[PDB]
Amino acid sequence: MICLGLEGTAEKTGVGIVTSDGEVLFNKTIMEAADHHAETFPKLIKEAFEVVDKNEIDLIAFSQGPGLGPSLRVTATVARTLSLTLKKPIIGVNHCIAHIEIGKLTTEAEDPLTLYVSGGNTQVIAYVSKKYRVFGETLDIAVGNCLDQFARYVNLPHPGGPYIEELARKGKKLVDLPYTVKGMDIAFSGLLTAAMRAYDAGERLEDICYSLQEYAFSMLTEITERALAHTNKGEVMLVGGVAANNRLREMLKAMCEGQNVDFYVPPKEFCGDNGAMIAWLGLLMHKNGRWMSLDETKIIPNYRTDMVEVNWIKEIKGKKRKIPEHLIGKGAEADIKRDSYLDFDVIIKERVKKGYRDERLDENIRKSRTAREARYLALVKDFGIPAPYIFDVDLDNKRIMMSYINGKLAKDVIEDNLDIAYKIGEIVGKLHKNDVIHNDLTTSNFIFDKDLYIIDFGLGKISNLDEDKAVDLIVFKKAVLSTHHEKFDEIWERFLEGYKSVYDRWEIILELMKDVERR
Ligand SMILES: Nc1ncnc2c1ncn2[C@@H]1O[C@H](COP(=O)(O)OP(=O)(O)NP(=O)(O)O)[C@@H](O)[C@H]1O
The missing domain is CATH 3.30.420.40 (ATPase, nucleotide binding domain)
Incomplete structure (x- = not known):
C-alpha cells in the first residue's frame, strides 16, 4: 500500500507520496490564494508522477481541516477529482494530527x-x-x-x-x-x-x-x-x-x-505544511480499517482533533513520566514554607526562577505576580470573600508571608460535597460584581476551613468588560472538565447557582459565554 497526499489549507500548496513502510517517495511544497492553489496543484501532481507512477497509488488523502474556508474547498476539489480519475479510495485527514504524526515518524x-x-x-x-x-x-x-x-x-x-x-x-x-x-x-x-x-x-x-x-x-x-x-x-x-x-x-x-x-x-521538510504528512495519516487511518464515502469528505474548517477516531495506535506508548505523591516542585511556580509570626500559623510563598526564560523577563514576571497576589488577596476582602491575611510582601525576593488556612482544597472535597461548588460561584460572582478578574479559576485554588477561601490571585486584573468575565468562566469551565470530568454537569450546574445568587448581570455574561464557545 502506497498513498498520495494533497495539502493546501492557506498559502502553501503541497503534495507528497509515502509508503506504508514510512518512506517519503516524493514531497514538494511551493508558496484569493485559493486560486493560487488550483493554479499550481496540477503542476505538482505531474512532477510527482514523474518520480512515482499514477497506477500504483492506492489512496488519495487530503487535508480536510482545520483551515481557511474557501482555500480548503479547492484542495478538496482537486483530490476528490483525482480519486475518481484513478478509480481509487479517498480519505480526509485532520491537519493538526497529521503534523503530530509525521513528527512521530521522522524523530523516533x-x-x-x-x-x-x-x-x-x-x-x-x-x-x-x-x-x-x-x-x-x-x-x-x-x-x-x-x-x-x-x-x-x-x-x-x-x-x-x-x-x-x-x-x-x-x-x-x-x-x-x-x-x-x-x-x-x-x-x-x-x-x-x-x-x-x-x-x-x-x-x-x-x-x-x-x-x-x-x-x-x-x-x-x-x-x-x-x-x-x-x-x-x-x-x-x-x-x-x-x-x-x-x-x-x-x-x-x-x-x-x-x-x-x-x-x-x-526536519524542515515535515515541520511546516507539506503533502507527505497528509499522505501518512491517510495511509495510517486507512491501513487499519477506515474507508470514506465521497459524501463523507465534506470540508470542515473547525475540525477539532477529538472529532477524529484514533485507530492507528494500539502499541506501547513510548517513554512516560512517573507521577509520585506530595513530591516536591521540580518545575513549580511557588515554594511554600510553613512558619509562625505573632503567634499566627503562616505561609511564606516564593515564586522561584524559571530557568528557561530570560532573567529580565523572569524577574518582571515573578515580581508582577506576587504584587498582584498581595493586591487582590487583600482587596478581595472588601467584598466579603474569605481570604488569607497578607502579613508582608517582598518584591526583591518575590516572597509573601500570608495566613495559613487549615482545611482541604476544593478539588479534594468538591466531588463528594457539592455545596463547595456553590461557594466558588459566589466568590467569582463577587469578583465579577466588582470588575475584578481571576485569570486562573480552578478547584485547586480554593481552600475550605469552615468557609471557602481563594488562596491564589497571581494573575488578577481589574477589568470591567463582559468579555473578560465570560472568559473567566470559560477557564474555570475547562478546569472543571479536565480534573472533575465525571462529576462535571453537576459541579457546573451547581457553580452557576452560586454565581446566580450573587451577580445580577449573570445572564448577559453567561449568554456572552455561549457566544465565545463557537468562535
Ligand atoms: N524562524 C521563524 N521564527 C518565527 N516564526 C516563523 C519562523 N519561520 C516561520 N515562521 C512562521 O510560521 C508560519 C508559517 O508556517 P506554516 O506551518 O506554513 O503556517 P500555516 O500556513 O498556518 N500552516 P500549518 O502549520 O499547517 O497551520 C508563519 O506565520 C511564519 O511567520
Whole structure:
C-alpha cells in the first residue's frame, strides 16, 4: 500500500507520496490564494508522477481541516477529482494530527505532548484516553499570525517570522509588553497591539522584536509546561512553521531539560505544511480499517482533533513520566514554607526562577505576580470573600508571608460535597460584581476551613468588560472538565447557582459565554 497526499489549507500548496513502510517517495511544497492553489496543484501532481507512477497509488488523502474556508474547498476539489480519475479510495485527514504524526515518524519520538505553532494555529495537543486531545491554545490569533501582523506593520518582508528573529538577536532593551495567560490558554491580540504602539512610541526595532519574541515564546512555554503536568508524557514535540525559530526551540529545550523530558523537532521538510504528512495519516487511518464515502469528505474548517477516531495506535506508548505523591516542585511556580509570626500559623510563598526564560523577563514576571497576589488577596476582602491575611510582601525576593488556612482544597472535597461548588460561584460572582478578574479559576485554588477561601490571585486584573468575565468562566469551565470530568454537569450546574445568587448581570455574561464557545 502506497498513498498520495494533497495539502493546501492557506498559502502553501503541497503534495507528497509515502509508503506504508514510512518512506517519503516524493514531497514538494511551493508558496484569493485559493486560486493560487488550483493554479499550481496540477503542476505538482505531474512532477510527482514523474518520480512515482499514477497506477500504483492506492489512496488519495487530503487535508480536510482545520483551515481557511474557501482555500480548503479547492484542495478538496482537486483530490476528490483525482480519486475518481484513478478509480481509487479517498480519505480526509485532520491537519493538526497529521503534523503530530509525521513528527512521530521522522524523530523516533513515540508519544509526545506536542506544541503546534504556525501562522494559523497555536495548540498543545496530546494523545490522552483514546483521542487526540487539546490542552491549551490561543484564544484569538496564532503566534505565526501575531508575528506576521507585526512584521507587516513594521514593514518587513512577508513570511515575517525569520526577519523578526534576526533583528531580535541584536536587541538590548526588554520592553514592557503584556504577558497574558488565561488558565491553560493564551491570547496574543494584546501583545500584538502593544508591540505596535511601542514601535509608534519610538522604541528601537531590535528591542521590540527581542521582546515580542521573549514574551510570545515564554507564554507558549508556560502553557506547554503547565499542560505537561496534566500528563505523564516523557517527551515534548514542537511542530509547525513557527518551529523554525531557534530561540523558541532554545527556550523549550531548557524547560524540557529542567523537567527531565526529552525534546523533539522534526526536519524542515515535515515541520511546516507539506503533502507527505497528509499522505501518512491517510495511509495510517486507512491501513487499519477506515474507508470514506465521497459524501463523507465534506470540508470542515473547525475540525477539532477529538472529532477524529484514533485507530492507528494500539502499541506501547513510548517513554512516560512517573507521577509520585506530595513530591516536591521540580518545575513549580511557588515554594511554600510553613512558619509562625505573632503567634499566627503562616505561609511564606516564593515564586522561584524559571530557568528557561530570560532573567529580565523572569524577574518582571515573578515580581508582577506576587504584587498582584498581595493586591487582590487583600482587596478581595472588601467584598466579603474569605481570604488569607497578607502579613508582608517582598518584591526583591518575590516572597509573601500570608495566613495559613487549615482545611482541604476544593478539588479534594468538591466531588463528594457539592455545596463547595456553590461557594466558588459566589466568590467569582463577587469578583465579577466588582470588575475584578481571576485569570486562573480552578478547584485547586480554593481552600475550605469552615468557609471557602481563594488562596491564589497571581494573575488578577481589574477589568470591567463582559468579555473578560465570560472568559473567566470559560477557564474555570475547562478546569472543571479536565480534573472533575465525571462529576462535571453537576459541579457546573451547581457553580452557576452560586454565581446566580450573587451577580445580577449573570445572564448577559453567561449568554456572552455561549457566544465565545463557537468562535
Ligand atoms: N524562524 C521563524 N521564527 C518565527 N516564526 C516563523 C519562523 N519561520 C516561520 N515562521 C512562521 O510560521 C508560519 C508559517 O508556517 P506554516 O506551518 O506554513 O503556517 P500555516 O500556513 O498556518 N500552516 P500549518 O502549520 O499547517 O497551520 C508563519 O506565520 C511564519 O511567520
